[PDB]
Symmetry: D2
Subunit: 317 residues, 4 copies
Amino acid sequence: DVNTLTRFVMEEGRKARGTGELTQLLNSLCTAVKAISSAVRKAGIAHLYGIAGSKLDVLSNDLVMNMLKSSFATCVLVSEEDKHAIIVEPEKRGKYVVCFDPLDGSSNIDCLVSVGTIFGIYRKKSTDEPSEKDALQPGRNLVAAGYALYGSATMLVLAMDCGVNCFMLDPAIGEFILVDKDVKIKKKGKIYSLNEGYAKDFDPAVTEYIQRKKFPPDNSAPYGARYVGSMVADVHRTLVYGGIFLYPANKKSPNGKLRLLYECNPMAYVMEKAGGMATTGKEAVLDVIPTDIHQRAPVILGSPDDVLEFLKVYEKH
Amino acid sequence: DVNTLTRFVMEEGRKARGTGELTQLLNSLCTAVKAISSAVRKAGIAHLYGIAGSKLDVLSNDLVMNMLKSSFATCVLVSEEDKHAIIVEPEKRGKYVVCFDPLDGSSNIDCLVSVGTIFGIYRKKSTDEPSEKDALQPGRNLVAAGYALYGSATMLVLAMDCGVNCFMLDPAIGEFILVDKDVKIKKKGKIYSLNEGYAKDFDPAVTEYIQRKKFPPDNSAPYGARYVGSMVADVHRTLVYGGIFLYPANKKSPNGKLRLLYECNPMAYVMEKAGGMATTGKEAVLDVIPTDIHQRAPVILGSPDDVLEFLKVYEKH
Amino acid sequence: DVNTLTRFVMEEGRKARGTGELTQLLNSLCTAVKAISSAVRKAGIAHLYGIAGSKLDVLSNDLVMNMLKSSFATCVLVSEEDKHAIIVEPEKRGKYVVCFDPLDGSSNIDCLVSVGTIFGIYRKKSTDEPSEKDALQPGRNLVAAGYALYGSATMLVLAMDCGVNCFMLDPAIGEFILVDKDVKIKKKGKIYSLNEGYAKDFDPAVTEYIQRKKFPPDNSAPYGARYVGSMVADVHRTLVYGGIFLYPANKKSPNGKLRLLYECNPMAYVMEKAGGMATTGKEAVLDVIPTDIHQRAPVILGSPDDVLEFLKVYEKH
Amino acid sequence: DVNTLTRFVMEEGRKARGTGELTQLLNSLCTAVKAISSAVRKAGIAHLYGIAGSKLDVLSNDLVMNMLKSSFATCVLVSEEDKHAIIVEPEKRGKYVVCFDPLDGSSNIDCLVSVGTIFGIYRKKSTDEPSEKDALQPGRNLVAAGYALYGSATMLVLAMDCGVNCFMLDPAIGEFILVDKDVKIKKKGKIYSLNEGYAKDFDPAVTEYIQRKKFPPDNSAPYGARYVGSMVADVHRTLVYGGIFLYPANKKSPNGKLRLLYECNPMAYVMEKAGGMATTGKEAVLDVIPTDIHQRAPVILGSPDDVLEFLKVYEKH
Ligand SMILES: O=S(=O)(Nc1nc2cc(Cl)ccc2o1)c1cc(Cl)ccc1Cl
Ligand SMILES: O=S(=O)(Nc1nc2cc(Cl)ccc2o1)c1cc(Cl)ccc1Cl
Ligand SMILES: O=S(=O)(Nc1nc2cc(Cl)ccc2o1)c1cc(Cl)ccc1Cl
Ligand SMILES: O=S(=O)(Nc1nc2cc(Cl)ccc2o1)c1cc(Cl)ccc1Cl
Ligand SMILES: [Mg+2]
Ligand SMILES: [Mg+2]
Ligand SMILES: [Mg+2]
Ligand SMILES: [Mg+2]
């Protein structure tokens, strides 16, 4: 029997006999996504080209930014687009701290590559004045996380303590329909995703692992390669078809390139909630403890076996 | 000053003081794409999930199939989805033969990866009865070709003798707006796209080439890796950012995996019209001569220098 | 600062520290409206006309019907489209009884005239088994009522104890935006709306009133005539521009033609909540007490002064 | 077998082995309508209400204005929104003169009443320099005329020498689908449409006619009254259900209130092409000869019998 992101969220909140604050927060994020999805698909692009006569990275941030301040459920907001955390006005304060990537893979949107919105929701901890500090919780403290993928179609994957659920956006009625209830990732996959152009800077562990995929030692079948470049898209494929996604440290930043707060953590959390794993090589991504908000991190995630089979090789070095 | 795919096509046809048959054909293809784009984005998916109470590969084929027969400009139609060429009914016959892939990368649409529609338009040659034979012309005989990419947004790239033009689909008014006039590809790019999982079966030439990209000999900067798996998406990125896309022969079919008639040829033609190259390793893709309609072919295409730099290595072996 | 029907409803519910049952109910009705609005505008009509190869009164009923049973907030449902009240399955029962007109003015939808959805929500009273009886409450017992107008644009007018609010449907992002907060109707208007073809059967009171509008006795300016035929549209214009709408008893049914439960009551309630009036000639519409569910009623509603100025004449006879 | 406004227009043009200038003109008008329809339904209204942070009469005019100049098929353009005719730039000149009402019933768009776009297309006559004079042709000189109705759904009625055809706008794929081929109006209808608030100023003929409808002399059934106020909507209902629409001269302008060039003429032409009639009381609307471009005219149109039955009474006075 049919269900929607809204109906579904207020049923969970109303069942956990909660406040409703998280629900308001999520609903507001949902509206923002729909507005972003509309912009990403080139809503009224004909007008920009003078159909009547006479920056997407920004609009997205504003949508999420504005929609979240407006929910009265947020107090501190961190965004890949803002150098500093944003402190919600006093009258608009809520108990939640949100970290998000308004639009990811944006730079590559000229070639219409799948882009997406990532987000993480923590409950404010210290009773001090809400500040950037409140955002430095480890992914292990997430209350809910997820992302919206603007691909061939627009889907929103939401992971909460109760598991991971996928909602398809029906553009004809502007509603998110639940199409994959309590999702779980394959134990082992047949695909490895990473940028092999930096093959030159791969630390030994990584180079050895990739080698075992192209040329399986047990003379089995090789894995298939796939890398869209837009994380949301890659991680999502990893979640659907199973496999492993990698964006390790190298010659550049030995802490990876991806941002921990609003890129690695939400995805790790989703993965782990779906039965997968997310390690930085040394430790679990959700355990890492934030120092800076734009702090980076190495990430290897996906199907258990694959991530484990990685760590296996990681120790060997 | 604003222009659309329709306004633009009937201005070319009306300027070449032509019949208008090609125009009707293109317009019909345009409608089909809009209908496919709507389906790909999950138009009324809420209804499938019982919002009121109680296969995309197919729908696409039917849209294109029906829309083209209905144009009265086609006589013989070849589609990746039909084992045999389709012979248009006598009353609905036109002078054009069309080859198309209704939906490409379809199998990977579960993970919402960019998919697309590819197409090639030839003028019927022999005055015999229209038959599958009429479809066996070499890509060099194309009258027009192109593809529709259903990615973050829906774009339609159209290449004709007059060059290559890109139109963005404004979903708000269902019109294709011309946003990139007479496109031309970069001489050299900084990205190589291919499935490195079949690294095990790469003939020497390919392995050596990829090696020169990961580890540039002139100790320059390496290329970046990118492979979406969905041709339309990859080829399009190659056209926008420049670079090289490869899907060579191996242990499997030594004639590649891609279909020549409705995948390689249209793309080669677009590439060549934009100033790029499309070789099968031995010869230019547009020169190859069709034997079977579902005949396969190896493809290496993109920026000139890159394709040439490839062939350089190809001869070496 | 921006607000939506959802954000707005769950803020009222969450502020009245309520259950959330009413909220789920309203949200479900909201989804149904968006689905209906999509169908009314001819969503995928191209498919019905064989774009790929090979009743609205009903679809609307099913949407509302299904969406409401699915909310778990309804127990007894009455609809202009169902001869008998519908008793929600035990597992899906809620404390609310809903009366609605899935689509009004439907018969006149061939000429694309504004149509709309009307609805009334009562709280079940007797602790007996939910039955048709539970639906026989007087409009005075309404918990919330309203209607959705599918005109030049789709708007949803919601009236609750806290007043009447209007939400515009942004089709680009499928969200209902609050554009007219706590609405109130003009004291006196300059427009009278009714079907003057039945001038032959007007009881004296009505004929005299209309006369005083066409030929104002105080030799002032006449009122303007307007009658769309589709109630939702007429009543809405009455609410926006002010004035009076009439659909009195005559030679036919001396109880009017409009249905009391799901047409007159919701509108009366909205009117009265916006500062207007709704009388049957003898008494207030919200006071009338239901005998049959499809029971009819005479209605005169709109701006106070105008309705009063009517009753003035009504007594005179 | 499926057909669209575009496919249909370029089949007529291509069949009449014409230039294609009229086709380009119509196509451009079609794009403008789709853009207007999108705006009328409140496309991105959420943005106006600060969803991200921080006049329709005009936008419509600009759309049509710009889209027509851009077609290279117009030379002189008259619009209800421009005090003077507009002379297309030399490089953009075409052989056609167009008269249009970008948006009609606009003032009443606050109550979401059906609005519409009306248009008339004449072929420039004098070989002088294109000037306002070229627009003063009688409706009898029309090459094509029609209107777009933005009601419960968006339809475009197109009347040319070959008859009248109706196209429904499928918003899901932004295409106009032909749903009523070569339309013809009922000989006699059962509905009269006019503003009876001006009952006080009706010349005798009109008052007597209306009387014969409310109280049929042959003691038959009365006609039903209907008046939306927005011409496009009323005239369209008249065309679909049959009947008569009236907007006669009175105490105010004895030449009516409707504009002759871009309101009366297009509708008269459509009516007459559908088998109806359009008189000003004294003569046929299409015969009247323009003096001023914003010149007004009395109009009575619709089913033959009804219009005739009117004129019958008209002579009697
Ligand atoms: O803190 S909540 O927002 N509590 C809550 N949401 C409600 C929605 C309705 Cl309609 C009624 C009552 C609610 O309480 C919440 C939200 C979710 Cl996703 C899951 C658990 C909880 Cl605890
Ligand atoms: O064979 S055509 O279709 N000739 C043609 N198209 C017309 C469109 C109009 Cl509106 C009027 C006259 C036309 O002639 C054609 C179409 C294109 Cl894309 C480019 C060159 C030609 Cl040759
Ligand atoms: O009975 S309710 O549905 N109570 C309620 N709705 C909630 C929504 C959230 Cl997100 C959280 C708590 C809620 O409690 C309700 C709904 C409305 Cl329109 C107005 C007053 C009330 Cl009383
Ligand atoms: O003057 S036209 O525009 N001639 C014309 N239109 C064409 C479209 C195509 Cl695709 C090809 C040739 C054409 O010639 C024209 C347009 C219509 Cl609605 C009806 C008759 C005519 Cl005469
Ligand atoms: Mg990012
Ligand atoms: Mg394919
Ligand atoms: Mg009704
Ligand atoms: Mg007007």
